[PDB]
Design a protein around this motif. Structure first.
Motif, PDB file in Angstrom:
ATOM      1  N   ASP A   1      23.670 -36.603  96.022  1.00  0.00           N
ATOM      2  CA  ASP A   1      22.433 -36.189  95.374  1.00  0.00           C
ATOM      3  C   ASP A   1      22.315 -34.668  95.376  1.00  0.00           C
ATOM      4  N   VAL A   2      22.733 -34.047  96.476  1.00  0.00           N
ATOM      5  CA  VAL A   2      22.685 -32.596  96.593  1.00  0.00           C
ATOM      6  C   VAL A   2      23.554 -31.955  95.519  1.00  0.00           C
TER       7      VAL A   2
ATOM      8  N   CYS B   1      22.109 -32.134  92.269  1.00  0.00           N
ATOM      9  CA  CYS B   1      21.002 -31.218  92.001  1.00  0.00           C
ATOM     10  C   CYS B   1      21.396 -30.169  90.965  1.00  0.00           C
TER      11      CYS B   1
ATOM     12  N   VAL C   1      20.653 -24.691  93.416  1.00  0.00           N
ATOM     13  CA  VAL C   1      21.142 -24.575  94.785  1.00  0.00           C
ATOM     14  C   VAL C   1      20.909 -23.166  95.315  1.00  0.00           C
TER      15      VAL C   1
ATOM     16  N   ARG D   1      16.333 -32.433  91.002  1.00  0.00           N
ATOM     17  CA  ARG D   1      15.980 -31.948  92.330  1.00  0.00           C
ATOM     18  C   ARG D   1      16.691 -30.642  92.655  1.00  0.00           C
TER      19      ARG D   1
ATOM     20  N   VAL E   1      18.252 -28.439  95.657  1.00  0.00           N
ATOM     21  CA  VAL E   1      18.721 -28.483  97.034  1.00  0.00           C
ATOM     22  C   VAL E   1      18.754 -27.091  97.648  1.00  0.00           C
TER      23      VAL E   1
ATOM     24  N   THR F   1      13.633 -34.515 100.469  1.00  0.00           N
ATOM     25  CA  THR F   1      14.505 -34.949 101.558  1.00  0.00           C
ATOM     26  C   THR F   1      15.130 -33.772 102.296  1.00  0.00           C
ATOM     27  N   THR F   2      14.995 -33.783 103.619  1.00  0.00           N
ATOM     28  CA  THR F   2      15.548 -32.730 104.463  1.00  0.00           C
ATOM     29  C   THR F   2      16.595 -33.295 105.417  1.00  0.00           C
TER      30      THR F   2
ATOM     31  N   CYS G   1      19.048 -28.755 105.143  1.00  0.00           N
ATOM     32  CA  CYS G   1      19.236 -28.987 103.716  1.00  0.00           C
ATOM     33  C   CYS G   1      18.098 -29.825 103.145  1.00  0.00           C
ATOM     34  N   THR G   2      17.130 -29.161 102.521  1.00  0.00           N
ATOM     35  CA  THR G   2      15.992 -29.855 101.932  1.00  0.00           C
ATOM     36  C   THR G   2      16.140 -29.977 100.421  1.00  0.00           C
ATOM     37  N   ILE G   3      15.692 -31.107  99.891  1.00  0.00           N
ATOM     38  CA  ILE G   3      15.739 -31.361  98.460  1.00  0.00           C
ATOM     39  C   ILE G   3      14.324 -31.617  97.952  1.00  0.00           C
ATOM     40  N   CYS G   4      13.994 -31.078  96.783  1.00  0.00           N
ATOM     41  CA  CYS G   4      12.651 -31.242  96.240  1.00  0.00           C
ATOM     42  C   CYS G   4      12.667 -31.674  94.779  1.00  0.00           C
TER      43      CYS G   4
END
Length: 123
Positions: A19-20, A23, A26, A82, A84, A105-106, A114-117
């Motif tokens: 998923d990262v 993204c 980055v 998202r 990352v 998600t962190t 590593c947080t994702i929004c």
């Protein structure tokens, strides 16, 4: 997992990476509008990239291995996707025009947050 996993991450962890790499944006929370350095970006890239090889599934690693090759690549972001962050993000933050990033998600890998929004329009 943390220690129980160490380096041999399972499909659950790698799913987060997929998923990262998926993204569109980055960057680092400490400086989202400004990168770190050529060696810096590559450094973080080696962290996850190293997780792939050591992985148990050599076939799956190939898929993400190529997705990582484009880590921090120039691309147009959009809602639904998202962002990352190499540092993280606990609070909502704007990204551009009127799109706001909300904590999704962190995860900490190799001692790196590593947080994702989710990219949602501020309205």
């Amino acid at each position: 997992g943390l220690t129980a996993t160490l380096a041999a991450l399972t499909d659950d962890d790698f799913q987060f990476l997929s998923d990262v790499l998926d993204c569109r944006a980055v960057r680092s929370a400490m400086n989202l509008r400004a990168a770190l350095t050529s060696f810096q970006v590559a450094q973080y890239r080696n962290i996850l990239n190293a997780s792939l090889q050591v992985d148990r599934d050599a076939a799956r690693s190939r898929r993400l291995m190529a997705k990582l090759a484009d880590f921090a690549v120039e691309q147009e972001v959009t809602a639904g996707d998202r962002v990352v962050v190499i540092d993280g993000l606990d609070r909502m933050a704007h990204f551009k025009d009127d799109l706001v990033l909300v904590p999704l998600t962190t995860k900490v890998v190799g001692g790196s947050r590593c947080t994702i929004c989710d990219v949602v329009k501020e309205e």
